Design a protein around this ligand. Structure first.
Ligand SMILES: Cc1cc2nc3c(=O)[nH]c(=O)nc-3n(C[C@H](O)[C@H](O)[C@H](O)COP(=O)(O)O)c2cc1C
Ligand SMILES: Cc1cc2nc3c(=O)[nH]c(=O)nc-3n(C[C@H](O)[C@H](O)[C@H](O)COP(=O)(O)O)c2cc1C
Lengths: 174, 175
């Protein structure tokens, strides 16, 4: 599709089904992720592809995180069933350098932009998805599953697959 | 311009000159910024357009912030001359809601995405730019000029104008 048309009319999709992006479609999404702005070229991200048996392993981690977080019966099954809302999930970890000339927040911004860049690359190839987070991004069990050091941060669970403009209020002139 | 090719080949440009995007070109850039992901639709951003005489006002604000930060002569003059590296600057402020169900970091993330989306909208229309920050985003004088409350944050100075002028293996893991 047209670049300007996507940038002006980008919409997410939460109801996702097969097929997911695979092969060069998935490779293009990951290429878009690593092309985001990056102060001093630190490349401060890791992209965890979750599909197939990885989806069930992700499900068991989210379930174990919701139990440790003190969820009720509703919350644990929702957490267990959360990964099954898409054929593909990409988890983006901000892999940050501490006490760097670049503050941590700028490196986190780069990782967050990678999430939107990947969702846009999904839409451009005829797919879609939704950037999700929730309280489980802070779960100690989920973080250790994604190899989060203290300075690292889970910025998004990007669900992906096949789905089923007046800026005046925000603009000021300096 | 093809959407996927822009996303895969995106590059910034620091050498920027007139013309700046104006009219519907500028409006299209601002439309892209307001279309970013936004948890619970808080719209937590403000876009400050800096052009013309505004560039001089931005120059004086940055110079004031450099003085108050203890910069030397070189750093103060560099701050004063910083806005004149492009015909257009859009400063993005994360306008955050505290003690909301949506954590502040998710709202700040939305405002940062707005910078990149606007930069891509510049590229799509034949312009380009560079997302900049530096220590002066934390300056008390600079923050006040951009009406920052304590919970607000300057996430970028997006310089824009007419430019003059991938292997994901190490970062991808399979869960
Ligand atoms: C939050 C953020 C702040 C940045 N601040 C600066 C900056 O102050 N100065 C700078 O040269 N680059 C800064 N960058 C990086 C540039 O925007 C740009 O990504 C870099 O020059 C690499 O060029 P490229 O985008 O073409 O890959 C920043 C990036 C991010 C995400
Ligand atoms: C950092 C971040 C985290 C988000 N987390 C969630 C989430 O956990 N659940 C959700 O429904 N939407 C979340 N969103 C918002 C969605 O990504 C999406 O923008 C929203 O559903 C509106 O869809 P739209 O992009 O078409 O406007 C988040 C957005 C951001 C920027």
């Amino acid at each position: 599709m047209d670049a300007l048309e996507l940038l002006v009319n980008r919409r997410s999709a939460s109801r996702l089904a097969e097929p997911a992006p695979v092969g060069e479609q998935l490779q293009n999404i990951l290429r878009a992720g690593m092309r985001v702005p990056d102060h001093k070229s630190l490349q401060p991200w890791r992209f965890f592809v979750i599909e197939g048996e990885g989806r069930d392993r992700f499900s068991a981690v989210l379930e174990q995180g919701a139990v440790a977080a003190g969820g009720d019966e509703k919350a644990i099954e929702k957490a267990r069933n959360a990964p099954f809302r898409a054929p593909l999930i990409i988890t983006v970890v901000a892999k940050c350098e501490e006490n760097h000339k670049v503050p941590v927040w700028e490196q986190e911004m780069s990782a967050g932009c990678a999430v939107m860049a990947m969702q846009m690359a999904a839409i451009a190839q005829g797919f879609n998805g939704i950037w999700r987070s929730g309280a489980l991004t802070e779960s100690a069990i989920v973080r250790e599953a994604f190899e989060c050091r203290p300075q690292d941060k889970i910025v998004g669970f990007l669900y992906l697959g096949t789905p089923q403009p007046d800026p005046t209020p925000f603009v000021r002139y300096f």
